Amino acid sequence: XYXXXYX
Amino acid sequence: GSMCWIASYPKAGGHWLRCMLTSYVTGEPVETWPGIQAGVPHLEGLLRDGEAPSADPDEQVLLATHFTADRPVLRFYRESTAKVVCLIRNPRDAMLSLMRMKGIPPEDVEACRKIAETFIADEGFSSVRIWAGEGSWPENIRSWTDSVHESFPNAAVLAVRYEDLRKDPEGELWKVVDFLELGGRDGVADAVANCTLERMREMEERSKLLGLETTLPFVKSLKFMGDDIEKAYADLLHGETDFAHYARLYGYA
Amino acid sequence: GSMCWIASYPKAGGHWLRCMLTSYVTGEPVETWPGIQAGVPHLEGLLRDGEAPSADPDEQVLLATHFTADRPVLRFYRESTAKVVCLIRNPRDAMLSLMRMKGIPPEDVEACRKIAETFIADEGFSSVRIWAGEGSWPENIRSWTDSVHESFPNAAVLAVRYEDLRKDPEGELWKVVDFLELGGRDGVADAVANCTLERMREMEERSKKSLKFMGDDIEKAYADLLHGETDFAHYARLYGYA
Numbered sequence: 001x002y003x004x005x006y007x
Numbered sequence: 008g009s010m011c012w013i014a015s016y017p018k019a020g021g022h023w024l025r026c027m028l029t030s031y032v033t034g035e036p037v038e039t040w041p042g043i044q045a046g047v048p049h050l051e052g053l054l055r056d057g058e059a060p061s062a063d064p065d066e067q068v069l070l071a072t073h074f075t076a077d078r079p080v081l082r083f084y085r086e087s088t089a090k091v092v093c094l095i096r097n098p099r100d101a102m103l104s105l106m107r108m109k110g111i112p113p114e115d116v117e118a119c120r121k122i123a124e125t126f127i128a129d130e131g132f133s134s135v136r137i138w139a140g141e142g143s144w145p146e147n148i149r150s151w152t153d154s155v156h157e158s159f160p161n162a163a164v165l166a167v168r169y170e171d172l173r174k175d176p177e178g179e180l181w182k183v184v185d186f187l188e189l190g191g192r193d194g195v196a197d198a199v200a201n202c203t204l205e206r207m208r209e210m211e212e213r214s215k216l217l218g219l220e221t222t223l224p225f226v227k228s229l230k231f232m233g234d235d236i237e238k239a240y241a242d243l244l245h246g247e248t249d250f251a252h253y254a255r256l257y258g259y260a
Numbered sequence: 261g262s263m264c265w266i267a268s269y270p271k272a273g274g275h276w277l278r279c280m281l282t283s284y285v286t287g288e289p290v291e292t293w294p295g296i297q298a299g300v301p302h303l304e305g306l307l308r309d310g311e312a313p314s315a316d317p318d319e320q321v322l323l324a325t326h327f328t329a330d331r332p333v334l335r336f337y338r339e340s341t342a343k344v345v346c347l348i349r350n351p352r353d354a355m356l357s358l359m360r361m362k363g364i365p366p367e368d369v370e371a372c373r374k375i376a377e378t379f380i381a382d383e384g385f386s387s388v389r390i391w392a393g394e395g396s397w398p399e400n401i402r403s404w405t406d407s408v409h410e411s412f413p414n415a416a417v418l419a420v421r422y423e424d425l426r427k428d429p430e431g432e433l434w435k436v437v438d439f440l441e442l443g444g445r446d447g448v449a450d451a452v453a454n455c456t457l458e459r460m461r462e463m464e465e466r467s468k469k470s471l472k473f474m475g476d477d478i479e480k481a482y483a484d485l486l487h488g489e490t491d492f493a494h495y496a497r498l499y500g501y502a
């Protein structure tokens with residue numbers, strides 16, 4: 001993983 | 008040349024291929040969610056930490072990425088790359104997959120249409136801020152398959168379809184394992200049993216219960232929201248863009 | 261070689277350093293926020309996009325980072341790195357800085373406390389999700405200064421306190437310019453004027469205290485650290501933060 005956003 | 012990529016577009020089934028690949032090498036299951044990341048490290052995740060695998064190692068290495076092959080950062084592995092496994096999935100289903108991952112129940116048309124319509128305009132997930140450097144669906148595909156030698160002049164490619172894998176898990180994991188020369192085959196049936204749908208949900212929850220670094224739940228077709236959107240996809244699908252060209256080729260027309 | 265780093269722990273006024281530097285190299289003012297990333301790109305920013313400048317590139321290149329010099333990814337630049345600027349600020353202010361950012365109005369007791377509690381236990385921002393690979397405060401300084409040669413064997417280092425820049429913008433900026441060999445001195449004036457606190461907050465938007473309060477116990481906690489046996493006290497002392 002290693003995933004962005006902002007939620 | 009001992010570097011090997013599991014390249015894939017977001018939501019093609021990367022964790023699963025990733026999870027079965029680890030199981031086969033370890034020989035035992037994967038008991039915990041970052042075991043996946045331990046096993047077939049996802050490049051992006053390694054960079055967040057400032058980690059990076061050695062350029063040019065002596066014995067075989069397996070990484071995963073959603074990057075187009077041409078993205079500068081990969082220039083570093085230009086000669087060390089021996090093998091590419093390109094995992095591909097129906098774009099209709101990748102799009103649906105993001106809605107499920109975002110939460111969003113199949114009723115909220117407004118909510119779903121927005122993603123769907125954005126998906127169609129962008130020919131993929133480029134506007135979704137969850138990933139970067141992936142390009143559009145066809146862009147990705149082109150760079151790993153048709154163009155791979157523009158980025159890795161020494162590489163050989165296997166392609167594998169998400170759907171082939173669901174239909175014949177053990178036969179398909181085998182192509183990938185034989186391609187990458189990871190060895191046996193009696194190992195194959197086991198790896199599949201370990202990284203089942205069921206096994207995976209529980210393996211997600213157990214991690215999640217032991218307050219662990221996990222990627223809100225993580226683990227159908229077109230009629231429901233549309234007409235307007237049905238035609239919109241169809242037009243893209245059977246149109247004259249490179250998307251169409253690839254959708255036709257992997258049999259999604 | 262020809263690679264140059266503006267290295268700094270998060271919240272040490274790296275943005276401003278970069279802004280000013282971008283303004284001097286360009287001559288013109290900074291047309292706004294992304295301008296900063298175009299000029300002195302932040303390496304994390306680039307890797308997120310899959311972007312990464314080539315090792316051994318034949319003309320001078322300036323990047324920024326919060327990584328410790330010893331992070332595996334900087335390894336590709338091991339040989340080709342010539343110059344490091346290491347920007348350092350009172351870790352008392354960095355901490356207070358995360359707060360304003362994280363939103364909190366200074367009279368939110370249990371909210372400040374916790375972050376402060378954490379910062380002191382960690383000696384920096386290890387437990388703060390916004391950054392990664394930056395290590396702890398001493399660790400970061402150590403690796404870019406006293407131990408720089410363990411990562412960048414051909415590099416020279418100019419260390420620079422945020423507080424000295426604030427006390428003399430043009431003098432200190434020119435010390436950085438001079439060290440990097442970007443030319444004159446004359447430019448240095450305008451560049452400071454092109455990136456002042458005002459032009460800054462304006463570039464952020466047209467794009468898109470001390471330990472007194474609640475101290476008693478915390479104040480103590482911090483001060484015990486600041487006069488501890490650790491690498492945190494070493495650098496505090498050494499940079500006048502004690």
Ligand SMILES: Nc1ncnc2c1ncn2[C@@H]1O[C@H](COP(=O)(O)O)[C@@H](OP(=O)(O)O)[C@H]1O
Pocket residue numbers: 016017018019020021022023100103104105107108173202203204205207225226
């Ligand atoms: N063990 C498994 N078997 C089959 N599909 C799986 C699986 N584990 C994950 N998937 C599916 O792979 C998709 C996510 O892909 P990625 O891991 O690359 O983001 C999701 O599809 P759906 O959401 O369509 O069910 C997810 O449920």
